[PDB]
Amino acid sequence: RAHKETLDKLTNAAINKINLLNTSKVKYLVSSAFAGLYVGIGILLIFTIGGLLTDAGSPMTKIVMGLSFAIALSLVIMTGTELFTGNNMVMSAGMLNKGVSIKDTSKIWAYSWVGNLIGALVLGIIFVGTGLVDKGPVAEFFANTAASKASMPFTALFFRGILCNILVCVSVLCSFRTNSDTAKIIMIFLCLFAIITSGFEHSVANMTIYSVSLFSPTISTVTIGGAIYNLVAVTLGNIVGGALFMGLGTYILGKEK
Amino acid sequence: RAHKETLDKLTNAAINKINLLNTSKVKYLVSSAFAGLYVGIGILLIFTIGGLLTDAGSPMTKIVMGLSFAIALSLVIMTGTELFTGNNMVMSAGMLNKGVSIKDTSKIWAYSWVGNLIGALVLGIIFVGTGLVDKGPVAEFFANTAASKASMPFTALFFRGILCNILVCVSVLCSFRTNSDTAKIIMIFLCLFAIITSGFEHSVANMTIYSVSLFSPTISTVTIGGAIYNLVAVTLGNIVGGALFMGLGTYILGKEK
Amino acid sequence: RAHKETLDKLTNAAINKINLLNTSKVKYLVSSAFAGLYVGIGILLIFTIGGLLTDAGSPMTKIVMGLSFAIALSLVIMTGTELFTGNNMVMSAGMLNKGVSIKDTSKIWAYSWVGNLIGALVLGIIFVGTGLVDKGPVAEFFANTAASKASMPFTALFFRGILCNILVCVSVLCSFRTNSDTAKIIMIFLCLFAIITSGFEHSVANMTIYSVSLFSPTISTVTIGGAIYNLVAVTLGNIVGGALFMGLGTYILGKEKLNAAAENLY
Amino acid sequence: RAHKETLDKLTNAAINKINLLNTSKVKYLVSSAFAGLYVGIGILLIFTIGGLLTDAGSPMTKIVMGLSFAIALSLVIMTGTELFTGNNMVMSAGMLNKGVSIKDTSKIWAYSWVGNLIGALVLGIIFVGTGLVDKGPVAEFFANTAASKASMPFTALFFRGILCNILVCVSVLCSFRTNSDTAKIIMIFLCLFAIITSGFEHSVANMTIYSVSLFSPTISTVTIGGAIYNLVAVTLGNIVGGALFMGLGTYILGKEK
Amino acid sequence: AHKETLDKLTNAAINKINLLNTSKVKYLVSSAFAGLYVGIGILLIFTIGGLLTDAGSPMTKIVMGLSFAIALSLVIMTGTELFTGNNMVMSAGMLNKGVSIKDTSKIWAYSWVGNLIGALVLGIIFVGTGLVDKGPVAEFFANTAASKASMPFTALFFRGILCNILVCVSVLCSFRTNSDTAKIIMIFLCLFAIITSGFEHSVANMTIYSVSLFSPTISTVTIGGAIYNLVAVTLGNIVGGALFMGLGTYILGKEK
Ligand SMILES: CCCCCCCCO[C@@H]1O[C@H](CO)[C@@H](O)[C@H](O)[C@H]1O
Ligand SMILES: CCCCCCCCO[C@@H]1O[C@H](CO)[C@@H](O)[C@H](O)[C@H]1O
Ligand SMILES: CCCCCCCCO[C@@H]1O[C@H](CO)[C@@H](O)[C@H](O)[C@H]1O
Ligand SMILES: CCCCCCCCO[C@@H]1O[C@H](CO)[C@@H](O)[C@H](O)[C@H]1O
């Protein structure tokens, strides 16, 4: 094990995040926007896959979607950009280890969440302009998925959000624990396969699901109300998974007591 | 050849394990709980696959499930967390090599088994909360699988547990014999593929099978009694495979006489 | 982090490109020609797959095509040759960081683009010469695809071009951010999967699509006006994606803000 | 090209093998037993696959089997254990190069062959004990394969053994020519894919095929005379493939003359 | 790093001719291994071809391409002498004045013949397994051999060109990376392209014809057919490897 080294790295990354934000809100928001859009790119890919295999009646739909989502977090980690969901574990661990404050943590979470959203809104806009969701099985996949995610009960979304961010954050944790970029990508691939195929909920990914569905004139039954309901429920779950499980857990393992 | 050095690393790992437990029961149990939960995440993924493909009558079902289970031990190894089944070989070799004692071994086995179960209990509760096993093929897949595992003859479960833990512990052994994290993950992928598709029995994975099946009000094919029956038989078989084959074996290979 | 170091690498890459171009038109155009042909090789592969699976009715067609396209940018990055689409991000970042001039940039872009085109033309001539697109599902896939791309609205092609080059350029960016050649190839595989299966537009790849179709004797029904319209719309799209998004974006991330010799972020 | 360096490595390895055997028969036999069982694990997996896909009438059966066999030699190489077929090239090259005697070679061949057999016997007994070949397509797949392998003309088996051990030994040769463990596993994956899907014959894998077939009450398609016939023919072919092609070939490339 | 790459190709060309000059046996043995290693890839993918063609699968050519990587991977990882790869290496080394034209034709002649010996040996042994006595694999060899030998010259020539661009560029990648895993991946991608696209490889065809001509399965092949295919494809391979990759890498790297 190298639990203490790992906690040191998490704490140093938390310190580095808040110093970045304090040094430049533009730099922090651009990074956050990049991460939001990168995650959204994975969504565009796997929903195209979703539409294609759904229209085909394939039993393998959710499995192929899961296998194909690795790009989302892979791009985030390989570009060193700012992802809200990953920040749940990093800021909480660093905060518990007294490297950052609670205010620092809430500031980082707020900014990366908004930045992530800006990225998703841009992607959504651009994607709608390609005409790829003007009509057909791919537009319908966005339309139906958006609707079902927005009509789920609060408790279900919350618990799905917890399990999702346990997986997002453990993949981030693995990247702090190896020097091999290939190993990092493989672990990301495995974790995101688990997330998508199992049906867990990811606030940042949902941002693109809703920006596309909402910006698309291919009607679809969503509404901003439903989008907000889902994002709030899922964000709360994500925070619990990342901070209360992963952040607290890694702190307990690594705390120089 | 390099068996001596491998035995040396195994011995040191066994020494570090008992020192951790002597230092902090909380740290040790948290690490164990993480590992039990990580293994369970693999179960949630492949049982989702099992439900999807069984429902479709696919002949590829058990093959796809085996290929998709790699995350379970990959997460454990890459996070440095405490897994009971792997401890069967490590403590065993370490004890034989006079680095730790018999009571040290029994203590580590008991705590890691219980801590792993804690992780499975937590994951099961949260998974039930997702609503993902309310009804439909995934719930059916948990219910039917838990039922069949609980009604297998003792001897069958025992021998399945032996072969399972030979594979788990050899994947752990490979991790002690390479410096490449990518190669570690590949070997784990191969061994877990063999375990799942061949039909071998893993006590720690079964903890999540039974936590989900028993916590879900939607599932009513098994009882705590059936869970205990399967867990006891499979755990005994696991111990024989990890300690009697892999532990004794690596000691013999490595013991500088 | 580590964005500053990444910015320094992009800027050095930019300076090296204009330098080599200044030194030898021949060296630069051959490098660009290789890159154009390498990308086209990917097209020849996935369009053969397109033809095969389309004629078979498969629903996995576009997924298998996406999974099989990695060779295109993998070859470019592993041979270190000049690809127009990638040059958008590198030249703009370097220029913004005041390592290369606006003049240097539109030059590299011009030479790389044309050089990429030469490669596609030569590949197209040779491929048709194999007789593999004399008749049948593959020849048609080339034909029908060429027609559909040349008959889409500007807006659509533009935005498809933006998204395409975001992905092309981010894979180039990953290659600057790791020392693992395997991780580089894996990131390329993922990005190109996303590009092809999602349906984004790549100018350099389109160069080979139209060269084959305009060289193939199985008639056409696309025409040269269509091709150039496409390459124009997609190229502008590509430029915005790579220069406006990736170039400016990486500049902002990496530019050490003391300096400040000129502009202040907030 | 590094042909001399490669022969120098093969020669050191031959020396180290005979020294080990001379030092401890128990260590040498235990190591050989492990390698036999590890290869056998590959057989249990791919024959499970065989039964599943053959029962389903799948055309991809032999392809998936080949893709799934990599674990057999991957485990042997990553654990550093003694495999008879690999020793055909190593001992012969080291013998030609005067690092070891002809008698050392005979000794190593006989001991590893028998030790491999012990591992296969042990694996077979335990596998039968699982109830996994009690009845159904997997048992039938063992029964049918064991029978066809036993009824082939000597000539056919012999030449199949030559090509098999060209592939086993070249994968071993690859492992001497790289420092990348991931590259070693990939080359093993490719070679074993070629062996299984093409239909070549591996003596050590066949030990497990026949141990299961002869230990399972539900398998009556073959006799001990039949196993012995196949094993002799295939062993002879393996020896020619490994020693006369790979051993002599690598000696010729590397010998400073 | 074009200059360093050209230096590497030049040093590889020099070491090849030096080797041949020192020992024809060592050089021919190495060439025979490379021919057999490439042939092993053919045995595997033609087994796949027979299996899937018999089943009417639209994935046949795709699965074959994905499964051919072993052919050049064995060559590169064993350090053996492959004719097609020597088209780029010797030409680059020659233009860079490390070796002569005479050296090049010599290395080409010896590796081609050595590759062929490896293919003949493999074909004989494979026929001896009984695996092509009858059935869809035997049929796949016979039909493929016949189709390749009945193609027009021009078609074979151009397919040979694209094939060796891919073979040689995979070799080029191996000179431009220190990662053995990256080398294998690049080889996997290039061979996937070669096989699935339908390009022509002289050395691989050596095994196709040695198997088909040694096997009991009746084909319309004939030795005259094989030789015709091999000549046309070899010239195409030479053009692709020497004129494109050889000349190209020299131009990229030459410090002038
Ligand atoms: C272009 C869009 C910019 C969005 C900026 C959002 C910043 C919100 O502001 C932050 O929110 C937290 C809780 O609400 C507080 O605890 C922080 O102190 C506060 O800075
Ligand atoms: C909240 C979780 C508490 C876990 C406590 C586990 C303690 C088990 O206790 C152990 O049991 C063994 C026998 O099975 C003994 O041999 C060990 O000596 C003993 O320490
Ligand atoms: C040891 C393996 C996992 C043990 C999980 C124990 C959880 C049992 O708990 C209860 O059992 C009831 C009836 O069977 C269920 O109906 C209830 O949902 C559940 O509360
Ligand atoms: C699932 C199969 C994916 C294979 C990816 C392997 C990538 C490993 O990583 C690569 O290979 C070597 C690792 O041992 C290193 O030497 C290289 O530097 C590195 O590029």
Ligand SMILES: CCCCCCCCO[C@@H]1O[C@H](CO)[C@@H](O)[C@H](O)[C@H]1O
């Ligand atoms: C469990 C016991 C198995 C032991 C295997 C015994 C095989 C030894 O037997 C012999 O050894 C000689 C050299 O010492 C060789 O010359 C002979 O070839 C070999 O048959």
